[PDB]
Amino acid sequence: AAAEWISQQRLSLYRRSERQELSELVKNRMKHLGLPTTGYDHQNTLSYVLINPPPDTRLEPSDIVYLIRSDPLA
């Protein structure tokens, strides 16, 4: 009855995506080198730079403001 399990793995291995392919390749290398697989566990964001925006621009969350801080030793 091993053929039933072979067919189950065959359909699963055919249905797997490219992201699973890349993930298993990394994890295979990690086990071969000896590192734990967990912790390897994508970027749906868009970022840009606003140079000197007008003082009316709203501050959004996760905003990073470029600063020129004065010399601490001076």
Residue numbers of the site for another protein (CB under 8 A)?
2, 6, 9-10, 13-14, 18, 21-22, 24-25, 28, 32
CA gap 20, 41 in Å, rounded: 12
Cβ atoms of 42 and 52 closer than 8 Å = no
CA gap 3, 14 in Å, rounded: 16
| Nearer CB in complex with another protein: 2/73 | 2
| Nearer CB in complex with another protein: 21/60 | 21
| Nearer CB in complex with another protein: 1/68 | 1
